[model samples]
Target: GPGDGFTILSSKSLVLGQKLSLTQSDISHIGSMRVEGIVHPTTAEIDLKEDIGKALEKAGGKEFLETVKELRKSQGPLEVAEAAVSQSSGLAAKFVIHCHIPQWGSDKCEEQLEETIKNCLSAAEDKKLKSVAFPPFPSGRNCFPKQTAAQVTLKAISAHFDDSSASSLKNVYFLLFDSESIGIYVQEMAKL
Candidate 1:
């Protein structure tokens, strides 16, 4: 169903998919969508400074920026954190879950990733969101190798779903920003 904007990764517990898309797409109508950002101890900026910035602006604009800024102030930065849900005003989804992951090669890089995805799934369950779309983590700015990122991401997602007894979260989408990334994800999914 890639032609329809997504292709299922074909797993037992997790209904994961990969999408050839930018940060935001018309396909994200239900559930929530996630954007990657750093976990600062105190910063209001959402750091949507890359190609994903347009999507951040579309999702909430300056309000989103200001809101995230305040979020860090009150919530104590999102460092090594889980999903922090917020309003998605101008985007396609109902919410935007901000996930902060550690940089690659860090001692806790893999551990932080597990926590992030688990928290995101748990948040979706708490909110009764059925679907969520995520971009490849550690690939942006973190300089994670694309193939390794894809492998690790799918493994974490698959493991999370496998361990869950039951979850309201059904569909998980990996939103790749370009064709190269799309192919990389597709290749990884094929191995699973």
Candidate 2:
């Protein structure tokens, strides 16, 4: 599907606009039109400034802003800490990625929810998004089980690499809230 586009990561603010989020229910909602594929977190483009800003604004306040500044300059290989997916803008292959996968509140990661993220990747790739960014998801009120979230996220990321056009992917990043998620990423990613 490289003919479609590539999957990039972002750290900036993510907006699926108003159409995609309102229209598309899930990757495979209606039927076979499902989006299939995945990509690594680094290869996914991430914009540090915007993405983190949105998240801190949502979760923390003035204290969070300080945290965001620190993270922006902290350094080193990051982790897949959030969930982000884009939708087709219906023109010039533009996509409005919807990023709102709260946190896991239970033991198991939602397979369908993971698939939805994959759908976003697929759609973004199809639309040829050079780079994208997603806020750290499934860690806030949603309470995404940490271990399960990491496992599911890593699974989804590897799936992207397994695709025939894996090489086409540029950069993917998991904009995390704090170092906790990054620490988890380091531990689990080292396993692979």
Best by TM-score: 1
Candidate 1: segments with Cα more than 4 A from true spot: 1-45, 138-141
lDDT of each: 0.56, 0.40
Over 39-137, each residue of candidate 2 has an lDDT whose tens digit, in order, gives 212212334234333432343345534443444355322223333432222222233343334235433347644764665566567656554333344
The positional error of residue 31 in candidate 1, measured at the CA in angstroms, is 13
What value does the lDDT take at residue 181 in candidate 2?
61
Clashes of 2: 36
Name the best candidate (by lDDT). Answer: 1
TM-score for model 2?
A: 0.46
Q: What is the C-alpha lDDT profile of model 1 across 1-192, one tens digit per residue? A: 223434443333334432222232443322223322211111123455544444555546777777666766666456664457666665545666676656677887766667767777767666776666675453445556888767766777777776776666655656554667777776877775
Where is model 2 poorest over a 10-residue stretch in terms of lDDT?
17-26
Q: Could you tell me how far off, in angstroms, the CA of residue 4 lies in candidate 2 after the best superposition?
A: 30
